[PDB]
């Protein structure tokens, strides 16, 4: 069953007041989309971030993985910058999966890393506390963020 | 300074490539908006979810706290249901803060609790894994979500 | 060239501040997307709305055109109901093009017809005044809306 | 009523499947928000665009009307740049209304002018064809878009 047919079913359940939350078939399709991704685009031009992401993703799938040629810092003027960055990458590059990391919402709100599919659907995300608070190396932070975004949909890096 | 003037500064930084993450003034402003709120709307008609949220928020601020008299489950046909739920409350109720909890993304993607201000800005949020995995009492889940959403922007419940 | 490449050039212009509005290549690519579409989904379960749009779209392309099995009225709790209806159709059906027609914005704001591409991108659109004013048959309104949305990107129905 | 209550009424009609389009009260309320605005922000730092919009809006209301100090062209990397410009101005300026004009959607998709209220709700909008086609002066174009955006919610200059 294709993702669209799985989502159709969820939407019908919601409309008709029988939706009881996420279902096993749905989680499985999510996992499948990530693990089976053949091409992955990371919505950054910052080589530091890219390498942390790429190395982890290589433990889970057999995709070609690349970053962007433009600076996505301008997403930082939007309401939800991490998400904006993911849709910028979706507009300019064809891929199976898009991974973005940046600010969650307003200045002050900490960070969000998000994984989108090829139509811009939010498959998974994870957040860190504002760097003003945690003060960890950005490298260690992104690593923890990616790993938690995967574990929360049943994907272990082993 | 006013929130709008704080955000203008952040935006100027990003436009001109000198933005080095969240700043103290920015964190402080968010905490202030939450701690000083006079009216809070919880973006549900579900009594159980409301009570859990309210009892916590009364530990941190002195607001009148109320829930909605419409079912926001129809948000579940949109891309980011939890955010959609916040913006429905924003459209139909006047408050200083809006709290919503729902599915993060596509079916299977787990949960998001989000706090929005007076103009729909994302102030903070937290996520839980797909209920398919964690399998916890929802009321215990929402407690953990709200406390982490507060703690990641410097607000302690104790 | 591929749409992604075209958009990348535009974004590059914008970043550098040499963007002087839409380009012939961009118009040509939009036209191509529409005229060459093989499958079109109308984001509605309303047979009247469907028939109007179908018969017009058949004058411009050789697609299979269908509607949905679910009522996309629930998009009418969101900020931008017409756009929300398009993104619901995108989530539940595969197609080259999605056409949605509903309320522009807040209650009282009149109507929007919008055409999206297979990744959710906005190709063209058109509006009618609020029905409280114009008082015309819905089918006559949708016909005029569609024909406008097509002529403003250089597509003639004649 | 307050706008929030008029909106709840409308949403309730929708949930129950009895919504039969816009209503006179909702249209009145939109007109009211526009004509009675005391402050308006034009979401641009472009003087020519600002001036065309200001001179028209001064015929409809008695507001203070101002533009931004930042270039909102960075909106042009998002899916719907005109709307994004609106919500940038909302984030950095208090006002009763916000007016933005820029590209509707994808490169090549033509223009949109939009008017948002103080919570970012979409009150009205208007579109022009791709400039590649109409080939008009941008100032004539914006005059026509604002006028149509006002006239479609019952506001005559
Ligand atoms: C509608 C919906 C959905 O499809 N998926 C999720 C993700 C997930 O299941 O983790 C959520 C949170 C959701 O939204 P909502 O907060 O409205 O949850 C709807 C229903 O889905 C089940 N559910 C949601 N979150 C939890 C949870 O944390 N624990 C348990 N036991 N059930 C849950 C409950 O029956 C609940 O009434
Ligand atoms: C632009 C931006 C922002 O204003 N705030 C935040 C939230 C926060 O500061 O916690 C983020 C994540 C952000 O986006 P981006 O991922 O582009 O990070 C921007 C810059 O802000 C700093 N920064 C962001 N996240 C971290 C972190 O986890 N650790 C450290 N040390 N610095 C960080 C770095 O200078 C980094 O290059
Ligand atoms: C950045 C941008 C774009 O890529 N496409 C469009 C649609 C279109 O070209 O029809 C617009 C409106 C736009 O946004 P903005 O209002 O910021 O226009 C950017 C530049 O694009 C040109 N332009 C935009 N609207 C018009 C117009 O109505 N007439 C003419 N001659 N040029 C125009 C001008 O050079 C202008 O400085
Ligand atoms: C839900 C909704 C709404 O509240 N307002 C508007 C703006 C407006 O009233 O002008 C629209 C377009 C709408 O969405 P939708 O296309 O789903 O219409 C819902 C119903 O609202 C009435 N309606 C909408 N557009 C027209 C129109 O162009 N002509 C007429 N006569 N009725 C209309 C019809 O009863 C229709 O069944």
Asked if D70 contacts D45 with a C-beta cutoff of 8 angstroms, the reply is yes
Q: Are β-strands D122-128 and D111-117 bridged in parallel, bridged antiparallel, or unpaired?
A: antiparallel
Alpha carbon D151 to chain centroid, angstroms: 12
Domain, as residue range, for B98: 37-158
Return the SS3 of C83.
helix
Beta bridge partners of D124: D115
**Same-domain status, C57 and C18:** no
In chain D, which residues have their Cβ closer than 8 Å to the Cβ of A74?
A: 74, 77
How many domains is chain C built from?
2
Q: How many Å apart are CA C103 and CA C29, to the nearest integer?
A: 28
Q: How many Å apart are CA B107 and CA B71, to the nearest integer?
A: 19
Pairs of CB atoms within 8 A across B/D: 50
> How far does the CA of residue D74 sit from the closest CA of chain A (Å)?
6
Q: Give ∠ CA C59-C65-C66 in degrees, rounded to 5.
A: 145
Question: What atom of ligand 3 comes closest to residue D133's alpha carbon?
Answer: 10
In chain B, which residues have their Cβ closer than 8 Å to the Cβ of C91?
A: 77, 79, 106
Residue with token string 């004649």 = C158
Nearest Cα residue to A70 out of C107, D76, C75, C128: D76
The one-character DSSP state at C96 is S
Any idea what the CATH number is for the domain that residue B145 is in?
3.40.50.10150
In chain D, which residues have their Cβ closer than 8 Å to the Cβ of A88?
A: 77-78
Any idea what the CATH number is for the domain that residue C5 is in?
1.10.287.470
B17: left (phi over 0), alpha (psi -120 to 50) or beta: left
> How far does the CA of residue A78 sit from the closest CA of chain D (Å)?
7
Q: How many Å apart are CA C120 and CA D106, to the nearest integer?
A: 10
Would an 8 Å CB–CB cutoff place C8 in contact with chain A?
yes
The one-character DSSP state at D131 is H
Cα A22 to ligand 1 centroid, rounded to whole Å = 7
| Neighbour count for residue D137 (Cβ, 10 Å) | 10
CB-based contacts of D110, cutoff 8 Å, min separation 6: C22, C124, C152, C153, D103, D104, D127, D128, D129, D130, D131
Return the SS3 of A95.
coil
**Same-domain status, A147 and A103:** yes
Q: How many Å apart are CA D135 and CA B144, to the nearest integer?
A: 58
Pairs of CB atoms within 8 A across C/D: 171
Nearest to C92 among A11, A91, A93 (CB): A11
**Same-domain status, C4 and C30:** yes
**Same-domain status, A101 and A23:** no
Q: How many Å apart are CA A77 and CA C22, to the nearest integer?
A: 23
Q: How many Å apart are CA D90 and CA B121, to the nearest integer?
A: 10
Q: How many Å apart are CA A29 and CA A27, to the nearest integer?
A: 5
Determine whether the interchain pair B70/D118 forms a contact, defined as Cβ–Cβ distance below 8 Å: no
> How far does the CA of residue D93 sit from the closest CA of chain A (Å)?
14
Residue with token string 């969820």 = A10
Pocket lining for ligand 4, CB < 6 angstroms: C 76, 101-103, 107, 110-111, 128, 130-131, 136-138, 141; D 19-22
Pocket lining for ligand 3, CB < 6 angstroms: C 19-22; D 76, 101-103, 107, 110-111, 128, 130-131, 136, 138, 141
| Neighbour count for residue B140 (Cβ, 10 Å) | 11
**Same-domain status, A49 and A121:** yes
Return the SS3 of A38.
coil
Q: Give ∠ CA A93-A94-A98 in degrees, rounded to 5.
A: 80
Nearest to B11 among D92, D118, D119 (CB): D92
**Same-domain status, C64 and C132:** yes
The side-by-side arrangement of strands in the sheet containing D64-67 is D64-67, D39-42, D97-103, D111-117, D122-128
Nearest Cα residue to A124 out of A100, A97, A103, A153: A153
Nearest Cα residue to D78 out of C11, A21, A105, A134: C11
**Same-domain status, A86 and A42:** yes
Give the up-direction half-sphere exposure of residue B130: CA atoms within 13 A in the CB hemisphere: 26
Residue C150, φ and ψ in degrees, nearest 5: -70, -50
Asked if C131 contacts C111 with a C-beta cutoff of 8 angstroms, the reply is yes
Collect contacts of B9-16 with beta carbons under 8 A, ≥24 apart: B10/A76, B10/A107, B11/A76, B11/A77, B11/D70, B11/D88, B11/D91, B11/D92, B12/D70, B14/A73, B14/A74, B14/A76, B14/A77, B15/A74, B15/A77, B15/D70, B15/D71, B15/D74
Nearest Cα residue to C61 out of C19, C85, C32, C29: C32
**Same-domain status, B42 and B113:** yes
DSSP C35-70: HT-SEEEES---HHHHHHHHHHHTTT---EEEE-SS
**Same-domain status, D78 and D113:** yes
Return the SS3 of D123.
strand
Question: What atom of ligand 2 comes closest to residue B21's alpha carbon?
Answer: 21
**Same-domain status, B132 and B84:** yes
Question: What atom of ligand 2 comes closest to residue A135's alpha carbon?
Answer: 31
Q: How many Å apart are CA A133 and CA B54, to the nearest integer?
A: 26
**Same-domain status, A32 and A66:** no
Q: Are β-strands A111-117 and C39-42 bridged in parallel, bridged antiparallel, or unpaired?
A: unpaired
In terms of C-beta density within 10 A (0-12 exposed, 13-18 middle, 19 or more buried), how is residue C20 classed?
Answer: exposed
- Structure-determination technique: X-ray
**Same-domain status, C28 and C91:** no
């Amino acid at each position: 069953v294709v993702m669209e047919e799985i989502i159709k079913k969820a939407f019908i359940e919601s409309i008709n007041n029988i939706r009881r939350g996420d279902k096993e078939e749905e989680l499985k399709k999510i996992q499948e989309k990530i693990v089976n991704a053949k091409k992955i685009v990371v919505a950054t031009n910052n080589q530091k971030k890219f390498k942390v992401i790429r190395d982890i993703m290589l433990r889970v799938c057999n995709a070609e993985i690349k970053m962007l040629d433009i600076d996505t810092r301008f997403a930082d003027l939007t309401r939800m910058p991490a998400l904006t960055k993911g849709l910028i990458a979706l507009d300019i590059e064809k891929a199976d999966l898009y991974i973005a990391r940046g600010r969650l919402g307003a200045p002050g709100s900490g960070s969000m890393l998000v994984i989108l599919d090829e139509k811009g659907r939010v498959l998974t995300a994870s957040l860190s506390p504002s760097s003003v608070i945690h003060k960890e190396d950005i490298e260690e932070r992104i690593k923890k963020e990616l790993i938690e975004a995967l574990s929360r949909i049943g994907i272990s890096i082993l």
